[PDB]
């Protein structure tokens, strides 16, 4: 009933899989960590940091109202 590929239990019970993955899996975990912890995520996605939801001049919700010029609108919201 096998379509050709190695069974998963075989692979994940092998030494070589674990020599590879005890490195690769933690590396991805800590890459995602660092992505968050360096602040890169905020800048990449434009998500406000806890101190940037409001500014010393905009105390209300920065709701977009403009149909085509949202870059300027966002920059004026800060």
């Amino acid at each position: 009933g096998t379509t050709g590929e190695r069974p998963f239990s075989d692979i994940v019970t092998s030494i070589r899989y674990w020599v590879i993955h005890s490195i690769t899996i933690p590396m991805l975990f800590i890459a995602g960590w660092l992505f968050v912890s360096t602040g890169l995520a905020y800048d990449a996605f434009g998500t406000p940091r806890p101190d940037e939801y409001f500014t010393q001049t905009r105390q209300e919700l920065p709701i977009l109202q403009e149909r085509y010029d949202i870059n300027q609108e966002i920059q004026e919201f800060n």
């Binding site: 009933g1 379509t3 940091r49 806890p50 101190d51 939801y53 409001f54």
Partner: protein, 334 residues
């Protein structure tokens, strides 16, 4: 031999068109009582002072309701959890005004459905079946008991039981959400998974069986005539259905054992409904759904809204309007 033995043989007879049984000897009278009263009250009952504030609510068709709006109205908040049989009313008119029909119908209905579940066991025993259809039936029974008995008990009044009507059901639901946030309660989430998944699995199983039917008919007659009642031969090709499904998702996700498949079909919705019944039964004691109102604060300390806050706004809107004349004090505790 004896008259009693002959009666026993009759009640427990598997030859009766409708099985009676010992549980049936309670089911039939109580269910007929509930049905007769329900029909009479839904058609012709006068208005009921559900909130106990002398503000009677018209439930019956003759008082201006349609089928959608009609209901048997829960008994008065003044009654609370007190037993209100007909003989405790000074007059039938008094009994009706205070919502006695609701109590009569509900108590008989609940006795009847528990006896129905017992009767399912009894007949399976008489037929030499396995005994657990009644266990599956205990899920709807649990939910019905939660909405008609447990929730009023926790809340302290049959006035807070689900009304016996369509719009009344909706009213019950809206107020329940306003007061308990049932949507944000994981047991209701599990109930939703139960019913969505049960419908999914019903569709999936029905469609796979229908897809793998063995050719026994022509294109003119219904393929249903390909199955003859009481054949042992299988009417569909389960191996072809497994081939299809294990290629649709992947091989090891598809059942090839019909027994395990049907156990799963039984168990999934039943467990989901048990969980949602328990959710309603525990919100009866005001252990409510999750409250994330003002969970996210900005650095200064201002609240940042989430969809939970929007939901709470809707809940407040429902809450401030419900039973608009019933509250004298600022907290809806009772």
């Amino acid at each position: 031999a004896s008259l009693w033995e002959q009666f026993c043989q009759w009640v427990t007879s598997t030859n009766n068109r409708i099985y009676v049984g010992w549980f049936g000897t309670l089911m039939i009278p109580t269910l007929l009582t509930a049905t007769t009263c329900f029909i009479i009250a839904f058609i012709a009952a006068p208005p009921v002072d559900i909130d106990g504030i002398r503000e009677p609510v018209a439930g019956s068709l003759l008082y201006g309701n349609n089928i959608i709006s009609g209901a048997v109205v829960p008994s008065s908040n003044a009654i609370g959890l007190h037993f209100y049989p007909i003989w405790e009313a000074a007059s039938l008119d008094e009994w009706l005004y205070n919502g006695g029909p609701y109590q009569l119908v509900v108590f008989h209905f609940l006795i009847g459905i528990f006896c129905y579940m017992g009767r399912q066991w009894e007949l399976s025993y008489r037929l030499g079946m396995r005994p657990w259809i009644c266990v599956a039936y205990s899920a709807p029974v649990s939910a019905a008991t939660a909405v008609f008995l447990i929730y009023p008990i926790g809340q302290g009044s049959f006035s807070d039981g689900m009304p016996l009507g369509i719009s009344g059901t909706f009213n019950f639901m809206i107020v329940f959400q306003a007061e308990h946030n049932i949507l944000m309660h994981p047991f209701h989430m599990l109930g939703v998974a139960g019913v969505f998944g049960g419908s999914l699995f019903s569709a999936m199983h029905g469609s796979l069986v229908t897809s793998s039917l063995v050719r026994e008919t022509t294109e003119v007659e219904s393929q249903n005539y390909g199955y003859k009642f009481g054949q042992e031969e299988e009417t569909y090709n389960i191996v072809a259905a497994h081939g299809y499904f294990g290629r649709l998702i992947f091989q090891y996700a598809s059942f090839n054992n019909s027994r395990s498949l049907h156990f799963f079909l039984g168990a999934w919705p039943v467990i989901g409904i048990w969980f949602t019944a328990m959710g309603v039964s525990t919100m009866a004691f005001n252990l409510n759904g999750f409250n994330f109102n003002q969970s996210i604060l900005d650095s200064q300390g201002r609240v940042i809204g989430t969809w939970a806050d929007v939901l709470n706004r809707a809940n407040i809107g429902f809450e401030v309007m419900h039973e608009r004349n019933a509250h004298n004090f600022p907290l809806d505790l009772a």
